[PDB]
Design a protein around this ligand. Structure first.
Ligand SMILES: Cc1cc2nc3c(=O)[nH]c(=O)nc-3n(C[C@H](O)[C@H](O)[C@H](O)COP(=O)(O)OP(=O)(O)OC[C@H]3O[C@@H](n4cnc5c(N)ncnc54)[C@H](O)[C@@H]3O)c2cc1C
Ligand SMILES: Cc1cc2oc(=O)n(CCC(=O)O)c2cc1Cl
Ligand SMILES: [Cl-]
Length: 448
């Protein structure tokens, strides 16, 4: 049996552990944190994520989708909250088969850990990777106290997240060609209780947005009707706009309350613990990191956030990481050798990771925001009705299909240009030649 060591019992690492172990690989998975399945007297994490077709299909192949979906809340569409305007649901898809799912992060991780162990993987917690000696095929791990443990390895999978220690170790033997693009927004997680969401009639089966241009809030529902709210706001005010809101200006919880009361007046009343959440929850960092190299020969490979940190504005990081896990297990299982598998995995996935990194950055303006937009949207709707196998909105290709991300981006660009051009020099739809637009659709977009 082929042997593998995986660092990081997160989402990608645990899924690839199950896929490899059920294929008979001898799998050892090392995780820095304690086992979340061991109940303690500490409060659980209320962090949630959007699960879409890419992630769901990966779980489906693993035999875990039904268990995960049992505690997921359907989000049928986007509920936009702008003061004055009553909220009205904007469906994401054609019917309830085209929805996204809000799931608790910790619950997803527990289901994945049980799945990896059921398939035969051995999981070792409270062990953080510190260093790798590639030439001697050994690695060093340690607990929080620095007590060290050395292990021999044969194949190393870095599934250890955006600040990957495997990635840092690879940088000692290969030039990874790393390009970091910092994101100016930080984020803060806040809570809406079940009592508060019910009192204010907040729709449970939707993804909620409070757009505000350079900043915004989103809220994803939980099974118990609580919601996890995330504020996206610049860490610092840029030199050009010193008066612009930023985390730097919010010196404490009371300042955060005044800011919410002024900028998000319909949201502030639902945030009962705003002051405490603001002071006790750390402000998170966002970034895009692009690597030219994801592997060291046949010895080590990165996947998920370890390989391609992205901004979260499309809710695709976990979805992409699970898709990566399926691809890596498929390549490893059937390749001539590990070196061939890692090179083929990297060549296949890199263009797709670049595409979702670009589309995630673009989705910020789509969420945080015109008569031109409405006309383009209406025209796009007619084209989708006339040609459902050719004109598929980019959001649907990314979220409800398994089309390679690079193809979703390429077709999305064709559609965006087609609409932009067709609406240019037009006041309304009545002056637009729909057949000429449809001719462009049949000419430029092959049926899927
Ligand atoms: C604000 C925000 C919202 C998001 N919302 C969504 C969403 O709605 N939908 C979506 O698809 N994605 C979302 N994402 C992205 C998603 O959280 C990540 O893309 C995803 O968790 C990556 O999975 P992963 O397994 O690669 O890494 P992780 O899930 O981060 O797992 C890495 C694991 O490695 C462990 N580890 C780290 N360092 C070491 C070490 N040295 N040794 C051993 N173990 C180590 C960690 O403890 C962890 O268990 C969001 C991200 C952010 C920041
Ligand atoms: C954390 C997060 C998760 C998400 O899941 C998604 O599908 N989106 C896009 C929603 C839309 O454009 O309406 C999304 C955005 C964020 Cl910031
Ligand atoms: Cl994301």
């Amino acid at each position: 049996a082929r042997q593998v060591t995986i660092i990081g019992a997160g989402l990608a690492g645990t899924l690839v552990a199950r896929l490899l172990a059920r294929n008979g690989w001898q799998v050892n998975l090392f995780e820095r944190r304690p086992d979340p399945r061991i109940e303690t007297g500490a409060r659980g994490r209320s962090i949630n994520l959007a699960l879409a077709e890419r992630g769901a299909h990966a779980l489906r192949l693993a035999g875990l989708e039904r268990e995960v979906l049992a505690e997921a809340v359907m989000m049928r569409g986007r509920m936009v909250h702008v003061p004055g305007t009553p909220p009205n649901l904007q469906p994401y898809g054609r019917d309830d088969s085209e929805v996204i799912w809000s799931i608790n992060r910790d619950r997803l991780n527990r289901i994945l850990l049980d799945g990896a162990e059921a398939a035969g993987a051995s999981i070792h917690f409270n062990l953080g990777l510190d260093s790798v000696d590639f030439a001697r095929q050994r690695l060093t791990l340690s607990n929080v106290s620095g007590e060290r443990l050395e292990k021999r390895f044969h194949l190393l999978i870095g599934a250890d997240g955006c600040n990957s220690a495997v990635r840092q170790a690879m940088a000692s033997v290969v030039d990874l060609g790393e390009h970091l693009e910092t994101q100016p927004h930080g984020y803060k997680e806040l809570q809406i209780t079940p009592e508060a969401s019910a009192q204010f009639n907040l729709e449970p089966n939707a993804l909620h947005i409070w757009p505000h241009g350079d900043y915004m809030c989103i809220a994803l529902p939980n099974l118990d009707r609580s919601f996890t709210v995330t504020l996206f706001l610049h860490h610092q005010s840029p030199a050009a706009q010193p008066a612009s809101p930023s985390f730097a200006q919010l010196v404490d919880g009371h300042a955060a309350r005044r800011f919410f009361q002024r900028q998000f007046p319909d949201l502030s009343p639902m945030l009962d613990s705003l002051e405490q959440d603001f002071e006790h929850h750390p402000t998170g960092k966002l970034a895009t990191l692009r690597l030219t190299t994801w592997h060291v020969g046949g010895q080590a490979v990165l996947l998920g956030d370890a390989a391609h940190p992205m901004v979260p504005f499309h809710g695709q990081g976990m979805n992409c990481a699970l898709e990566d896990a399926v691809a890596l297990a498929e390549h490893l299982q059937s390749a001539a050798d590990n070196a061939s598998a890692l090179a083929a995995f990297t060549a296949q996935r890199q263009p797709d990771a670049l595409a979702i990194q670009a589309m995630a950055l673009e989705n910020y303006v789509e969420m945080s925001s015109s008569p031109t937009y409405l006309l383009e949207r209406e025209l796009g709707q007619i084209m989708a009705q006339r040609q459902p196998t050719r004109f598929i909105p980019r959001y649907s290709m990314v979220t409800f299909s398994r089309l390679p991300y690079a193809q979703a981006m390429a077709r999305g660009q064709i559609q965006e240009q087609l609409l932009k051009f067709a609406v240019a020099n037009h006041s309304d739809l009545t002056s637009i030649n729909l057949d000429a637009v449809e001719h462009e659709v049949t000419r430029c977009l092959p049926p899927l």
